Amino acid sequence: NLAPLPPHVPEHLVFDFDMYNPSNLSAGVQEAWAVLQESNVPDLVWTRCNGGHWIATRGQLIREAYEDYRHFSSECPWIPREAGEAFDFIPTSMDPPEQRQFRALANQVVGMPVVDKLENRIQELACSLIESLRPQGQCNFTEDYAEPFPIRIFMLLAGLPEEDIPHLKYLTDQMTRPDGSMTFAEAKEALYDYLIPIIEQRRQKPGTDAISIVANGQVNGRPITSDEAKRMCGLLLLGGLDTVVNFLSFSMEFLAKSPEHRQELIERPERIPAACEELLRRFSLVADGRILTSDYEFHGVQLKKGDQILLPQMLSGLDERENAAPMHVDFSRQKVSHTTFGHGSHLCLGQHLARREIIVTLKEWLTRIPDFSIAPGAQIQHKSGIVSGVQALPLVWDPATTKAV
Ligand code: HEM
Ligand SMILES: [K+]
DSSP, X not given: OOOOOOTTSOGGGBOOOXXXXXXXXXXXXXXXXXXXXXXXXXXXXXXXXXGOEEEEOSHHHHHHHHHOTTXXXXXXXXXXXXXXXXXXXXXXXXXXXXXXXXXXXXXXXXXXXXXXXXXXXXXXXXXXXXXXXXXXXXXXXXXXXXXXHHHHHHHHHHTOOGGGHHHHHHHHHHHHSOOSSSOHHHHHHHHHHHHHHHHHHHHXXXXXXXXXXXXXXXXXXXXXXXXXXXXXXXXXXXXXXXXXXXXXXXXXXXXXXXXXXXXXXXXXXXXXXXXXXXXXXXXXXXXXXXXXXXXXXXXXXXXXXXXEEEOOHHHHTTOTTTSSSTTSOOTTOSOOOOOTTOOSTTOXXXXXXHHHHHHHHHHHHHTTOOSOEEOTTOOOOEEOSSBOEESOOEEEOOGGXXXXX
């Protein structure tokens, strides 16, 4: 339950927040995490949950910490510590300067240039799935669209058989929102067990798929090793199957309850990209951290070498000191401040692919099924972790109010 308070941790800074099951979850995950920004909560607190760790609750500290990799290392970014210690994905488990070379390689598979190339493909898949659902007048968004849309795109880019999705998806979810069936370490070894043969095979016979590119790639001009390729492909796998997938659901859940906001985008489609950013802020969902490389005093608090600190990317944009009325969605928001895709040298590499998938989904969906709502009686439930999500999303609509495009 609660780990005994280390001697150096001030008693009054204790706030037992459980990132894998926050007290106020029933009100929504973001709402649940936002409790950390209530009037009497300090900028930096310590929770005795999940082994004990600090938590920066404000955008100011979160951004500052992510910028200072000398003090806050990516070496151990996962909580609990056991997970953080087993965590060796590339390039996230690395700090500059060595981290850099691997980011460049990762960009060969997800960089903007590559994304633009995927535009037509992405649109075709979205239109395909939406048009197929359109006449049915209902669907559980998570399994009918949120999951298949981005996962298939990734699997295709990676050149991996779709039959493998169920196993892979289970493993990725155990790494972000474990149900207890396995530790982060076990899910990782299983993910690596899956990739090892595939990488060797792609290295012997170079292809044009994401795996081949990484596996036969160069970093700083030298050949990447089989282990490095594995550590990187594993991370790309995680991004492709458990980020956009979840974000889309938070977004659609909101749109299914906001006729006014839907009409805005229906009226002026050119506002979709802006709406996408506001949604990325309001429904931010990632939260990992760093480990102190040495004793360091941060904002009046004595952090000790080895201490873990959660720096919730999700909280920055929800911070009222960053955005007035943070909980309100305003597609017209003048300055949409957020760190949804991270901050610092570890800025999300899949962010361009993510925005494309989000915008295409909004554009293609609202143009065919402008009017829809949450299936009556549905008690939408959220799930919390390194990456938060929605359990199920039952949507309904009158087929007569749709349009084939
Ligand atoms: C809504 C979608 C997404 C969000 C909010 C998101 C968020 C993030 C965040 C917050 C980080 C920083 C972690 C840290 O600093 O420890 C990150 C890193 C990363 N993400 Fe994204 N992610 C998304 C989608 C994706 C996708 C689809 C992919 C791959 C296809 C991806 C690949 C990566 C990679 C490779 C990194 C590591 C960068 C490094 O360590 O230098 N992400 N992402
Ligand atoms: K580690």
